[PDB]
Coordinates of C-alpha atoms and ligand atoms in Angstrom, one line a residue:
Chain A
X1 CA 148.8 139.6 33.1
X2 CA 150.7 142.9 32.1
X3 CA 148.0 144.4 30.2
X4 CA 147.3 148.4 29.4
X5 CA 143.7 149.5 29.7
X6 CA 142.4 151.3 26.7
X7 CA 141.6 155.0 26.5
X8 CA 138.3 155.8 28.6
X9 CA 135.9 158.5 29.4
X10 CA 133.8 158.5 32.6
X11 CA 133.4 160.8 35.3
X12 CA 136.1 161.8 37.5
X13 CA 136.4 160.5 40.9
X14 CA 135.4 163.1 43.5
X15 CA 138.3 162.8 46.5
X16 CA 136.4 165.1 48.6
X17 CA 132.9 163.5 48.3
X18 CA 132.3 160.1 49.8
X19 CA 130.8 157.6 47.5
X20 CA 128.2 156.6 50.3
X21 CA 127.3 158.6 53.3
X22 CA 125.2 155.9 54.8
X23 CA 127.3 152.8 54.9
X24 CA 130.8 151.5 55.6
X25 CA 132.5 151.0 52.3
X26 CA 135.7 149.7 53.5
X27 CA 136.5 147.1 56.3
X28 CA 139.2 147.9 59.1
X29 CA 141.8 145.6 57.2
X30 CA 141.0 147.7 54.0
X31 CA 138.8 145.3 52.1
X32 CA 136.3 146.9 50.1
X33 CA 132.6 146.5 51.1
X34 CA 130.6 146.3 47.6
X35 CA 127.6 148.5 47.5
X36 CA 126.0 150.2 44.7
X37 CA 127.8 153.4 44.2
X38 CA 131.2 152.1 45.1
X39 CA 132.3 150.9 41.8
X40 CA 132.5 151.7 37.9
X41 CA 131.5 148.5 36.4
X42 CA 133.1 149.9 33.0
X43 CA 136.6 149.9 34.6
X44 CA 136.2 146.4 36.3
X45 CA 135.0 144.7 33.2
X46 CA 137.7 146.0 31.3
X47 CA 140.3 144.6 34.0
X48 CA 138.9 141.5 34.3
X49 CA 138.1 140.8 30.6
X50 CA 141.8 141.7 29.5
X51 CA 142.9 139.2 32.0
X52 CA 140.4 136.5 30.2
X53 CA 138.7 135.6 33.4
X54 CA 136.7 132.5 33.9
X55 CA 134.3 132.5 36.8
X56 CA 133.0 129.1 38.2
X57 CA 129.5 129.1 40.0
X58 CA 128.8 126.2 42.1
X59 CA 125.3 125.2 43.2
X60 CA 123.8 122.2 44.9
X61 CA 120.4 121.0 44.0
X62 CA 119.9 117.8 46.1
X63 CA 116.6 115.8 46.2
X64 CA 113.6 118.1 46.1
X65 CA 115.8 121.4 45.7
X66 CA 116.1 120.4 42.1
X67 CA 112.9 122.3 41.7
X68 CA 114.9 125.7 42.2
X69 CA 117.3 125.0 39.3
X70 CA 115.3 126.6 36.4
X71 CA 114.8 129.9 38.0
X72 CA 118.1 130.1 39.5
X73 CA 119.9 129.2 36.1
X74 CA 117.7 131.4 33.8
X75 CA 118.3 134.5 36.1
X76 CA 121.7 133.7 36.3
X77 CA 121.8 134.1 32.7
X78 CA 120.4 137.4 32.7
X79 CA 122.6 139.0 35.5
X80 CA 125.5 136.8 36.5
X81 CA 129.0 137.8 35.1
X82 CA 127.5 138.5 31.7
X83 CA 130.0 139.3 29.0
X84 CA 132.6 136.9 30.9
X85 CA 133.5 133.3 30.6
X86 CA 131.3 131.2 33.1
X87 CA 131.2 127.5 34.1
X88 CA 128.2 126.5 36.0
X89 CA 128.6 123.4 38.1
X90 CA 125.4 121.8 39.4
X91 CA 126.0 119.3 42.0
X92 CA 123.1 117.1 42.2
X93 CA 121.8 113.2 43.3
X94 CA 119.5 113.7 40.1
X95 CA 121.2 114.3 36.9
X96 CA 118.1 113.7 34.9
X97 CA 116.3 116.5 36.9
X98 CA 118.4 119.2 35.7
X99 CA 116.5 121.7 33.5
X100 CA 117.8 122.3 29.9
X101 CA 118.4 126.1 30.3
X102 CA 119.6 127.8 27.2
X103 CA 123.1 129.5 27.7
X104 CA 124.7 132.7 26.3
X105 CA 127.9 132.3 24.5
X106 CA 131.2 131.4 26.6
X107 CA 129.1 129.9 29.2
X108 CA 129.0 126.2 29.9
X109 CA 127.3 123.7 32.5
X110 CA 128.6 120.7 33.8
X111 CA 126.3 118.4 36.1
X112 CA 128.5 116.8 39.0
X113 CA 126.5 113.6 40.4
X114 CA 127.1 113.4 44.2
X115 CA 125.4 111.6 47.0
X116 CA 122.1 112.9 48.9
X117 CA 122.3 112.9 52.7
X118 CA 119.1 112.2 54.7
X119 CA 119.2 115.4 56.9
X120 CA 119.1 118.7 55.3
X121 CA 121.8 119.8 57.8
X122 CA 124.3 117.3 56.3
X123 CA 123.3 118.0 52.6
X124 CA 124.0 121.8 53.5
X125 CA 127.3 121.1 55.4
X126 CA 128.6 118.4 53.1
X127 CA 129.0 121.2 50.4
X128 CA 132.3 122.1 51.8
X129 CA 133.7 118.6 51.4
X130 CA 132.4 118.4 48.0
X131 CA 133.7 121.6 46.9
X132 CA 137.1 121.2 48.5
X133 CA 137.2 117.6 46.6
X134 CA 136.2 119.1 43.3
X135 CA 138.9 122.0 43.4
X136 CA 141.3 119.2 42.5
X137 CA 138.9 117.2 39.9
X138 CA 138.2 120.4 38.1
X139 CA 138.1 123.7 39.2
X140 CA 141.9 124.4 39.3
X141 CA 142.1 123.4 35.6
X142 CA 139.0 125.3 34.5
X143 CA 138.2 128.4 36.4
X144 CA 140.1 131.6 38.0
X145 CA 137.5 132.1 40.7
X146 CA 134.7 130.2 42.5
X147 CA 131.4 131.8 43.4
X148 CA 129.5 129.2 45.7
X149 CA 125.9 129.9 46.4
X150 CA 122.6 128.5 47.8
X151 CA 120.0 127.3 44.8
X152 CA 117.0 128.4 46.6
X153 CA 117.6 131.9 45.2
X154 CA 117.1 134.1 41.9
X155 CA 119.3 136.9 40.5
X156 CA 117.1 140.1 40.0
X157 CA 120.1 142.6 39.3
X158 CA 123.7 142.7 38.4
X159 CA 126.2 140.3 40.0
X160 CA 129.4 140.8 38.4
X161 CA 133.3 141.0 38.3
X162 CA 133.1 143.8 41.2
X163 CA 132.9 140.7 43.7
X164 CA 136.1 139.1 42.5
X165 CA 138.9 138.7 44.8
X166 CA 141.0 136.5 46.4
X167 CA 138.4 135.7 49.2
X168 CA 134.9 137.2 49.8
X169 CA 132.1 136.7 52.1
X170 CA 128.8 138.4 52.2
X171 CA 126.8 140.2 54.9
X172 CA 124.0 138.0 56.0
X173 CA 120.7 140.2 55.6
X174 CA 119.3 139.4 59.1
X175 CA 122.5 140.8 60.6
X176 CA 123.9 143.6 58.9
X177 CA 122.8 146.1 61.3
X178 CA 123.3 144.0 64.5
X179 CA 125.9 144.3 67.2
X180 CA 128.2 141.2 67.5
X181 CA 126.7 139.9 70.4
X182 CA 123.4 139.5 68.8
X183 CA 125.0 137.4 65.8
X184 CA 124.2 133.9 66.0
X185 CA 127.6 132.6 65.9
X186 CA 128.7 129.2 67.4
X187 CA 128.8 129.9 71.1
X188 CA 129.8 126.6 72.5
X189 CA 133.6 126.4 73.3
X190 CA 133.4 122.4 72.6
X191 CA 132.9 123.5 69.0
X192 CA 135.6 124.2 66.5
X193 CA 133.1 127.0 65.2
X194 CA 133.3 128.9 68.6
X195 CA 133.5 132.6 68.7
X196 CA 133.4 134.5 72.1
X197 CA 130.9 137.3 72.6
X198 CA 133.6 140.0 72.2
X199 CA 134.9 138.9 68.8
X200 CA 133.4 139.1 65.3
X201 CA 133.6 141.6 62.5
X202 CA 130.5 140.6 60.6
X203 CA 127.8 137.8 60.2
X204 CA 128.6 136.3 56.9
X205 CA 125.8 134.3 55.2
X206 CA 126.6 130.8 54.4
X207 CA 124.6 131.1 51.0
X208 CA 127.4 133.3 49.1
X209 CA 131.1 133.2 49.3
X210 CA 134.0 132.7 47.1
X211 CA 137.2 133.7 45.9
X212 CA 140.3 132.3 43.8
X213 CA 140.4 128.7 43.4
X214 CA 143.3 128.2 45.7
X215 CA 141.6 130.4 48.6
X216 CA 138.2 128.7 48.2
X217 CA 139.9 125.2 48.5
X218 CA 141.6 126.1 51.5
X219 CA 138.3 127.7 53.3
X220 CA 136.1 124.7 52.2
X221 CA 139.1 122.3 53.2
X222 CA 139.3 123.9 56.7
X223 CA 135.5 124.2 57.4
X224 CA 135.1 120.4 56.4
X225 CA 138.2 119.3 58.6
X226 CA 136.6 121.5 61.4
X227 CA 133.0 119.7 60.9
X228 CA 134.9 116.4 61.2
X229 CA 136.4 117.4 64.5
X230 CA 133.1 118.6 65.9
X231 CA 131.3 115.3 64.6
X232 CA 133.9 113.2 66.4
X233 CA 133.4 115.3 69.6
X234 CA 129.3 114.8 69.2
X235 CA 128.6 118.5 68.4
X236 CA 126.8 120.1 65.5
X237 CA 127.4 123.8 64.9
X238 CA 124.2 125.9 65.7
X239 CA 124.2 127.2 61.9
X240 CA 126.0 124.3 60.4
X241 CA 128.4 125.3 57.4
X242 CA 127.6 129.0 58.1
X243 CA 128.9 128.8 61.7
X244 CA 132.1 127.3 60.3
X245 CA 132.2 129.8 57.5
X246 CA 132.0 132.6 60.1
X247 CA 134.8 131.2 62.2
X248 CA 137.0 130.8 59.1
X249 CA 136.4 134.5 58.0
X250 CA 137.1 135.9 61.5
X251 CA 140.6 134.3 61.6
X252 CA 141.3 134.6 57.8
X253 CA 140.1 137.9 56.7
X254 CA 138.2 138.4 53.2
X255 CA 139.6 140.7 50.8
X256 CA 136.3 142.0 49.8
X257 CA 133.1 141.8 51.6
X258 CA 129.7 142.0 49.8
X259 CA 126.7 144.1 50.9
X260 CA 123.4 142.5 51.7
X261 CA 122.4 143.7 48.1
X262 CA 124.0 140.4 47.1
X263 CA 122.2 137.9 49.5
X264 CA 118.7 139.3 50.4
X265 CA 115.0 138.2 51.5
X266 CA 112.3 140.5 50.5
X267 CA 109.6 138.4 52.1
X268 CA 111.0 138.9 55.4
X269 CA 112.9 142.2 55.4
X270 CA 111.3 144.3 52.6
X271 CA 113.4 146.8 50.6
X272 CA 115.1 149.2 52.7
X273 CA 116.6 152.6 51.6
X274 CA 120.0 151.4 52.2
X275 CA 119.7 149.0 49.4
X276 CA 119.9 150.5 46.1
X277 CA 119.7 147.4 44.2
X278 CA 118.5 143.8 45.1
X279 CA 120.5 141.6 43.2
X280 CA 120.3 137.8 44.5
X281 CA 117.2 137.0 46.7
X282 CA 115.6 134.3 48.3
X283 CA 112.9 132.2 46.6
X284 CA 110.1 131.5 49.1
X285 CA 110.1 128.0 50.4
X286 CA 108.4 125.8 53.0
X287 CA 111.3 124.4 55.0
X288 CA 109.5 121.3 56.4
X289 CA 108.1 120.2 53.0
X290 CA 111.0 121.0 50.8
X291 CA 113.8 119.2 53.2
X292 CA 111.7 116.2 53.7
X293 CA 110.5 113.3 51.5
Chain B
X1 CA 151.2 131.8 53.7
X2 CA 148.1 130.0 55.3
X3 CA 148.4 131.4 58.7
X4 CA 145.4 132.0 61.2
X5 CA 144.9 135.5 63.1
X6 CA 145.0 135.0 67.1
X7 CA 142.2 135.8 69.0
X8 CA 141.9 139.8 69.1
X9 CA 139.6 142.1 70.9
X10 CA 138.8 145.4 69.1
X11 CA 135.8 147.7 68.4
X12 CA 133.0 146.2 66.0
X13 CA 133.1 147.7 62.3
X14 CA 129.9 149.6 61.9
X15 CA 128.0 148.6 58.9
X16 CA 125.7 151.6 58.8
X17 CA 128.3 154.2 59.9
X18 CA 130.7 155.6 57.2
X19 CA 134.2 155.8 58.3
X20 CA 134.7 159.1 56.6
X21 CA 131.8 161.3 55.8
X22 CA 134.2 164.1 54.4
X23 CA 136.4 162.1 51.8
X24 CA 136.3 159.2 49.1
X25 CA 137.6 156.0 50.8
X26 CA 137.4 153.7 47.8
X27 CA 138.2 154.3 44.2
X28 CA 135.7 153.3 41.4
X29 CA 137.9 150.1 40.8
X30 CA 137.6 149.2 44.4
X31 CA 141.0 150.1 45.6
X32 CA 141.0 151.5 49.1
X33 CA 142.0 155.1 49.6
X34 CA 144.0 155.4 52.7
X35 CA 143.1 157.8 55.2
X36 CA 143.1 157.8 59.1
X37 CA 140.1 156.4 60.3
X38 CA 139.7 153.7 57.4
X39 CA 142.1 151.0 59.0
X40 CA 142.8 149.1 62.3
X41 CA 146.5 149.0 62.4
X42 CA 146.3 146.3 64.9
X43 CA 144.6 143.7 62.4
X44 CA 147.2 144.9 59.7
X45 CA 150.3 144.4 61.6
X46 CA 149.0 141.1 62.6
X47 CA 148.4 140.0 59.1
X48 CA 151.6 141.3 57.7
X49 CA 153.7 140.1 60.6
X50 CA 152.5 136.7 60.2
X51 CA 153.7 136.6 56.6
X52 CA 157.0 137.8 57.6
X53 CA 157.1 140.9 55.4
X54 CA 160.2 142.7 54.6
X55 CA 159.8 146.2 53.2
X56 CA 162.3 148.0 51.1
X57 CA 162.5 151.9 51.1
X58 CA 164.6 153.6 48.2
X59 CA 165.8 157.2 48.3
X60 CA 168.1 159.0 46.1
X61 CA 170.5 161.2 47.7
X62 CA 172.5 162.7 44.8
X63 CA 174.9 165.8 44.9
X64 CA 173.7 168.1 47.2
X65 CA 170.4 166.4 48.4
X66 CA 173.0 164.2 50.7
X67 CA 172.3 167.0 53.2
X68 CA 168.5 165.5 53.5
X69 CA 169.6 162.0 54.6
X70 CA 170.2 162.6 58.3
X71 CA 166.6 163.8 59.1
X72 CA 165.0 161.4 56.6
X73 CA 166.5 158.5 58.2
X74 CA 166.0 159.5 61.7
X75 CA 162.4 160.0 61.4
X76 CA 162.0 156.9 59.2
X77 CA 163.3 155.1 62.3
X78 CA 160.5 156.8 64.4
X79 CA 157.6 156.3 62.2
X80 CA 158.2 154.1 59.0
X81 CA 157.1 150.4 59.5
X82 CA 158.2 150.1 63.0
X83 CA 158.0 146.4 64.0
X84 CA 158.5 145.1 60.6
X85 CA 161.5 144.1 58.7
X86 CA 163.2 147.1 56.9
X87 CA 165.8 147.5 54.4
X88 CA 166.7 151.0 53.2
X89 CA 168.6 151.4 50.0
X90 CA 170.3 154.8 49.8
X91 CA 171.3 155.4 46.1
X92 CA 174.1 158.1 46.1
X93 CA 177.0 159.5 44.2
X94 CA 179.0 160.0 47.6
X95 CA 178.9 156.9 49.9
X96 CA 181.0 158.6 52.4
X97 CA 178.5 161.4 52.9
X98 CA 175.7 159.0 54.1
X99 CA 175.3 160.0 57.9
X100 CA 175.6 157.0 60.3
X101 CA 172.1 156.8 61.8
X102 CA 171.4 154.0 64.6
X103 CA 168.8 151.8 63.3
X104 CA 166.4 149.5 65.3
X105 CA 166.5 145.8 65.5
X106 CA 165.5 144.0 62.1
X107 CA 166.3 147.3 60.0
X108 CA 169.6 147.6 57.7
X109 CA 170.5 150.1 55.4
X110 CA 172.7 149.3 51.9
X111 CA 174.4 152.4 50.3
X112 CA 174.2 152.1 46.5
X113 CA 176.6 153.9 44.5
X114 CA 175.1 155.4 41.3
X115 CA 176.3 158.3 38.8
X116 CA 175.3 161.7 39.1
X117 CA 173.7 163.7 36.4
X118 CA 174.0 167.3 35.6
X119 CA 170.4 168.5 35.3
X120 CA 168.3 167.9 38.3
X121 CA 165.6 166.6 35.8
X122 CA 167.6 163.9 34.7
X123 CA 168.7 162.9 38.4
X124 CA 165.0 162.8 39.2
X125 CA 163.9 161.0 35.9
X126 CA 166.9 158.3 36.1
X127 CA 165.5 157.1 39.5
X128 CA 163.2 154.8 37.4
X129 CA 166.0 153.2 35.6
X130 CA 168.1 152.9 38.5
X131 CA 165.1 151.2 40.8
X132 CA 164.2 149.1 37.7
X133 CA 167.9 147.8 37.4
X134 CA 168.3 147.1 41.5
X135 CA 165.0 145.2 41.2
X136 CA 167.2 142.2 39.5
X137 CA 170.5 143.1 41.4
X138 CA 169.0 142.9 45.1
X139 CA 165.3 143.6 45.4
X140 CA 163.7 140.6 44.2
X141 CA 166.0 138.5 46.7
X142 CA 165.7 140.9 49.5
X143 CA 162.2 142.5 50.1
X144 CA 158.6 141.6 49.5
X145 CA 157.4 145.3 49.0
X146 CA 159.2 148.4 47.6
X147 CA 158.4 151.9 48.9
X148 CA 160.1 154.8 46.6
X149 CA 160.1 158.3 48.1
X150 CA 162.0 161.6 47.7
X151 CA 164.7 162.3 49.9
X152 CA 163.7 166.2 50.8
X153 CA 161.2 165.1 53.3
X154 CA 160.6 163.9 56.9
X155 CA 158.2 161.4 58.7
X156 CA 156.3 163.2 61.2
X157 CA 153.8 160.2 61.9
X158 CA 152.9 156.6 61.3
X159 CA 153.5 155.4 58.0
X160 CA 153.1 151.6 58.3
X161 CA 151.7 148.3 56.7
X162 CA 148.3 149.9 55.6
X163 CA 150.2 150.9 52.5
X164 CA 151.2 147.7 51.4
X165 CA 149.5 146.3 48.2
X166 CA 150.4 145.0 44.8
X167 CA 150.7 148.6 43.4
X168 CA 150.1 151.9 45.2
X169 CA 150.4 155.6 44.1
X170 CA 149.9 158.7 46.3
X171 CA 147.7 161.8 46.0
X172 CA 149.7 164.8 45.2
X173 CA 148.9 167.5 47.8
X174 CA 148.6 170.2 45.4
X175 CA 145.8 168.5 43.3
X176 CA 143.6 166.2 45.6
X177 CA 140.8 168.6 45.3
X178 CA 141.3 169.7 41.7
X179 CA 139.2 168.9 38.6
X180 CA 141.1 166.6 35.9
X181 CA 141.6 169.5 33.6
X182 CA 143.6 171.4 36.2
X183 CA 146.0 168.5 36.4
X184 CA 149.4 168.9 35.5
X185 CA 149.4 165.9 33.2
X186 CA 151.8 166.1 30.1
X187 CA 149.2 167.4 27.4
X188 CA 151.5 167.2 24.3
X189 CA 150.7 164.3 22.3
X190 CA 154.2 163.9 21.0
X191 CA 155.1 162.6 24.5
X192 CA 154.6 158.9 25.8
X193 CA 153.4 160.7 29.0
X194 CA 150.3 162.4 27.3
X195 CA 147.0 162.3 28.8
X196 CA 143.9 163.8 27.1
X197 CA 141.8 166.5 29.2
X198 CA 138.9 164.1 29.5
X199 CA 141.1 161.3 31.1
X200 CA 142.7 160.7 34.3
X201 CA 141.3 159.4 37.8
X202 CA 144.0 161.2 40.2
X203 CA 147.1 163.3 40.1
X204 CA 149.6 160.9 41.9
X205 CA 152.7 162.3 43.1
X206 CA 156.3 161.1 42.0
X207 CA 157.5 161.4 45.3
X208 CA 156.0 158.5 46.9
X209 CA 155.0 155.1 45.1
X210 CA 155.7 151.5 45.5
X211 CA 154.2 147.9 45.6
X212 CA 155.4 144.4 45.2
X213 CA 158.7 143.9 43.7
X214 CA 157.1 142.7 40.6
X215 CA 154.8 145.5 40.1
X216 CA 157.6 148.2 40.9
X217 CA 159.7 146.6 38.6
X218 CA 157.1 147.0 35.8
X219 CA 156.2 150.2 36.7
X220 CA 159.8 151.7 36.6
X221 CA 160.7 149.9 33.5
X222 CA 157.7 151.0 31.7
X223 CA 158.4 154.5 32.6
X224 CA 162.2 154.4 31.8
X225 CA 161.3 152.9 28.4
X226 CA 158.8 155.8 27.9
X227 CA 161.4 158.3 28.9
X228 CA 163.8 157.0 26.4
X229 CA 161.1 157.1 23.7
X230 CA 160.5 160.6 24.6
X231 CA 164.3 161.4 24.6
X232 CA 164.9 159.9 21.0
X233 CA 161.9 162.1 19.9
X234 CA 163.4 165.4 21.6
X235 CA 160.8 165.9 24.2
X236 CA 161.0 166.0 28.0
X237 CA 157.7 165.5 29.8
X238 CA 156.6 168.5 31.7
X239 CA 156.9 167.1 35.3
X240 CA 159.4 164.6 34.4
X241 CA 159.3 160.9 36.1
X242 CA 155.7 162.2 37.7
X243 CA 154.2 162.7 34.3
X244 CA 155.0 159.2 33.3
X245 CA 153.9 157.7 36.7
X246 CA 150.8 159.5 36.1
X247 CA 150.5 157.9 32.5
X248 CA 151.2 154.4 33.8
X249 CA 148.8 154.5 36.8
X250 CA 146.1 155.8 34.6
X251 CA 146.4 152.8 32.3
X252 CA 147.3 150.1 35.0
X253 CA 145.2 150.9 38.0
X254 CA 146.7 150.9 41.7
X255 CA 145.4 148.5 44.1
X256 CA 145.5 150.9 46.8
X257 CA 145.9 154.9 46.4
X258 CA 147.3 156.9 49.6
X259 CA 145.7 160.2 50.8
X260 CA 147.8 163.4 51.0
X261 CA 148.3 162.7 54.5
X262 CA 151.3 160.6 53.2
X263 CA 152.6 163.2 50.8
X264 CA 152.3 166.6 52.2
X265 CA 153.7 170.3 52.1
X266 CA 152.9 172.2 55.2
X267 CA 154.6 175.5 54.3
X268 CA 152.5 175.8 51.3
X269 CA 149.4 174.0 52.3
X270 CA 148.8 174.3 56.1
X271 CA 147.0 171.8 58.0
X272 CA 143.4 171.5 56.6
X273 CA 140.7 169.7 58.6
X274 CA 140.5 166.7 56.2
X275 CA 144.0 165.8 57.2
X276 CA 143.8 164.2 60.5
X277 CA 147.3 163.3 60.3
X278 CA 150.3 164.8 58.5
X279 CA 152.7 161.8 58.0
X280 CA 155.6 162.6 55.4
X281 CA 156.2 165.9 54.7
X282 CA 158.5 168.4 52.6
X283 CA 161.6 169.9 54.2
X284 CA 161.8 173.5 53.2
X285 CA 164.6 174.0 50.4
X286 CA 165.6 176.4 47.9
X287 CA 165.6 174.7 44.6
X288 CA 168.1 177.0 42.8
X289 CA 170.5 176.7 45.3
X290 CA 170.3 172.9 46.1
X291 CA 170.0 171.7 42.5
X292 CA 173.1 173.3 41.1
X293 CA 176.7 173.5 42.3
Ligands
LIG1 O1 117.7 118.9 50.6 C1 118.5 119.8 50.6 C2 118.7 120.7 51.6 C3 119.9 121.7 51.3 N1 120.0 121.9 50.1 C4 121.3 122.6 49.6 O2 121.8 123.4 50.7 C5 121.5 124.8 50.6 C6 121.5 125.3 52.0 O3 119.7 124.8 52.4 P1 119.0 126.0 52.5 O4 118.8 126.9 51.4 O5 117.5 125.0 52.9 O6 119.2 126.7 53.8 P2 118.4 128.2 54.1 O7 118.7 129.2 53.2 O8 117.1 128.0 54.1 O9 119.3 128.5 55.5 C7 120.5 124.7 49.6 O10 120.3 126.3 48.9 C8 120.7 123.8 48.4 O11 121.8 124.4 47.7 C9 119.8 120.9 48.9 O12 120.2 120.8 47.7 N2 119.0 120.1 49.1
LIG2 O1 170.2 167.1 42.8 C1 169.3 166.2 42.9 C2 168.0 166.4 42.5 C3 167.0 165.2 42.8 N1 167.4 164.5 43.7 C4 166.4 163.4 43.9 O2 165.2 163.6 43.2 C5 164.0 163.6 44.2 C6 163.1 164.6 43.2 O3 163.7 165.8 43.0 P1 163.1 167.2 44.2 O4 162.7 166.7 45.4 O5 163.9 168.2 44.0 O6 161.7 167.3 43.3 P2 160.4 168.2 44.1 O7 160.2 167.8 45.3 O8 161.1 169.6 44.5 O9 159.4 168.5 42.8 C7 164.6 164.2 45.3 O10 164.0 164.1 46.4 C8 166.0 163.4 45.6 O11 165.7 162.2 45.9 C9 168.6 164.3 44.3 O12 169.1 163.4 44.7 N2 169.7 165.3 43.9
LIG3 MN1 119.1 129.0 51.0
LIG4 MN1 161.0 166.5 46.7

């Protein structure tokens, strides 16, 4: 914990030059918004390697979504926390369908067998319960941070220790330039996910969040308990786990926010100038086909 | 610790508008640089009041510097952490010379009697030993954060919970626009404070640093132990405690950096456009007169 950095030679920070002139790089509660140009990865790598950091990555591959694992894991090997200790946790109803992907040194993979729900909405929402539960089973004793992502994705560029913090969310790529009234929060007061039209900082994506194990256990437990209240009341939030994630992060502000570099869809949104890197991207899929037998 | 924010109405953060176009607002290790325009103090106040935060302020008033206490404490009452629990710790060789300043509710003051050294350099440097020591005597059991400042100063504007973080330093007002080779770090390899010409992020001021009690105890202990090594080797760093502070913060990066709004000298430097507020400022003094009998 008490550990000195070695001597390093790198460019001097420039106090009187903004690191970005086109985007917000800090939230109003002083959380960094992580864009390329904001960080020197050499300094961050040193800080996190000196603390012997282990990062857990959770991914759900239930029913037909096992098809996405090979690309997901291959590309994670090229781009996700390279040089750091990584533990992948693949949650699936089909252990035998997990592809045999070759891992770099210091990286391991565990297959966690879980039930499949019929409705895609329930598969998506029940990730919160399943993550919270495994926080006691394994994660508290095995990793320092958890990164919780969608599987229908691939890494195309660096995703590293710059994201690590007690609690982070990611700007949804559909909404980063939108006004809060256009955000697709849950708007029915009868749901635990309700956010009024005059509230909201950002629209966070359900496909990429994380933090310390303690903060992720808190978040996932809270979202699951809220879902259960909604279920008892006969209501399902408009965007499922993402709606609840958004309510949680409004009331418990994240300590870093990831830019849409970290959660993108090039088919739908192209490659705008404001994105210097496209790091973690959607794999094209046919919702109706892939979500049903 | 687990505490939800209430509903709040405030302006939506603007993802595609920088909060400052003229200054760096985040370090390359993703620490916020605190300037006006970077923070919504209403959100921060909520976060810190929900955690029932107590802030300790240490100040040394040794020998003739007791004269600075009345203005220092009066202006702290107007501007420093108003609304939060505050404990002032006045270190002095003359308990009876501490002025009777009226305090707001939830704010208290303790007088800590310490020895006076002859040389101003030693008075300044021995603050590290004295702070580290009182971390066990009182601070661990009494406060959450410590703010450690010069007494030859006055508050002129808000200094609040925006500064609070595990470890912070402040940009020295003489050097915030300077290249690292112009920084007045200790440049003799025989001193524990030595920093080579090609290293250094910022020139931090010895007059304003702080953090959690744990991190402040670490810092002050390390700087005192380094001073003692230098003393045994017959060398005194060029800028005394400030030199050692700079070496420490180079190797243990702060989690926030305060802009020179928080440490200014209007007589020497005026009021540049880049400073929207002048918060904590030098009181004009005659070094030779005030540092000697
Ligand atoms: O049949 C399913 C449906 C969903 N998921 C998981 O739930 C996540 C969220 O669903 P999806 O990616 O379909 O949501 P979208 O990105 O299309 O909104 C997926 O990435 C998978 O990890 C799954 O494993 N199987
Ligand atoms: O005789 C002295 C000399 C120094 N100090 C303390 O040490 C700090 C640092 O010294 P000073 O302010 O003279 O340094 P400068 O700001 O002029 O570099 C002061 O603010 C006081 O808190 C003191 O109390 N008495
Ligand atoms: Mn998806
Ligand atoms: Mn001073």
